[PDB]
Amino acid sequence: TCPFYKKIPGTGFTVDAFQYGVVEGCTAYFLTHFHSDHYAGLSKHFTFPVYCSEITGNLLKNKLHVQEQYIHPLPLDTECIVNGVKVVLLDANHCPGAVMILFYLPNGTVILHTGDFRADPSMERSLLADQKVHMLYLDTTYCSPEYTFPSQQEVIRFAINTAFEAVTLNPHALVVCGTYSIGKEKVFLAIADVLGSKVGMSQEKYKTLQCLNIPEINSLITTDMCSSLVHLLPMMQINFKGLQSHLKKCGGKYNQILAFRPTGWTHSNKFTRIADVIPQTKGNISIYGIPYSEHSSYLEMKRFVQWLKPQKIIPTVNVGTWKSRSTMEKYFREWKLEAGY
Ligand code: NI
């Protein structure tokens, strides 16, 4: 049944709650972003109002074939009325089109639902600064102190320099980047840019990218694999067998693959710096796992919450075990005591 942490008290609203059938008493279904665990259950047969960003609305229409009359896109950073309740969508710094939602309840309570986010100090100067938030529904994916990772910028720098060195040493090397959802486009776009290539990909992936309002996108991507030296493949094919196979498909145009797997966290982060990352190599194939995250680190999450000073926190991730729930509640209390709210 719909869990309580997907329901917004005092409204008829749910968030990211499309796989429970008809939720009893729900007048509007919000969708924070186009990732499968969140949209699971939507299709062309859905007949309730869906509220989301413009980009998420492009993907609903084009990829899932939801009918237009049920898609209600909202502009960001703008006070809007939905079924008699004031709401605002804010940028979540996750994947393209991903938002956080502020709800202003009739009784005067103010609720922020983060959806999926990567907390950033720039959020401290949005419309959030302007009033108090009583309740926070929080993306707790990496709510534990072992979870450190570099900035997105440092990671991209590493990848650009690595790729550029490799292809300049060997002009017959191919670069491959794995993907399995939207997000992390910067990785393959930045590499293609330094190499003066377009990124080549399947027709399904090209369609998905054309929904995302990325400026100058027609200049950066293509379905002609033959004219590109940066290829995108399913994350599943980023392994020695899948890459050898793919190399055979290119008709002796290339004699070496350099491949990137943008993972979330991996335990080499506990010890190793970005400068120090090394690939796994077999023959003429090398695979780099790079820690490019679109979720808050533990420290970024802590800073956001200590800034916001919420009266009550409701976690939306890692809620399935008592040991996780208990550990999270302990961190929330430390943070509260340290900051004095
Ligand atoms: Ni997500």
UniProtKB/Swiss-Prot annotation:
Residue stretches spanning the membrane: none
Superkingdom of origin organism: Eukaryota
Induction: During mitosis. The mRNA encoding this protein contains an internal ribosome entry site (IRES) in its 5'-UTR. This 5'-UTR generally suppresses translation while specifically promoting expression during mitosis, when cap-dependent translation may be impaired.
Subcellular location as annotated: Nucleus
Protein's job: May be required for DNA interstrand cross-link repair. Also required for checkpoint mediated cell cycle arrest in early prophase in response to mitotic spindle poisons. Possesses beta-lactamase activity, catalyzing the hydrolysis of penicillin G and nitrocefin. Exhibits no activity towards other beta-lactam antibiotic classes including cephalosporins (cefotaxime) and carbapenems (imipenem).
Assembly behavior: Binds constitutively to TP53BP1. Binds CDC27, which is itself a component of the anaphase promoting complex (APC). Binds PIAS1.
Protein name: DNA cross-link repair 1A protein
The species this protein was found in: Homo sapiens (Human)
Parent-protein residues present: 700 to 1040 of 1040
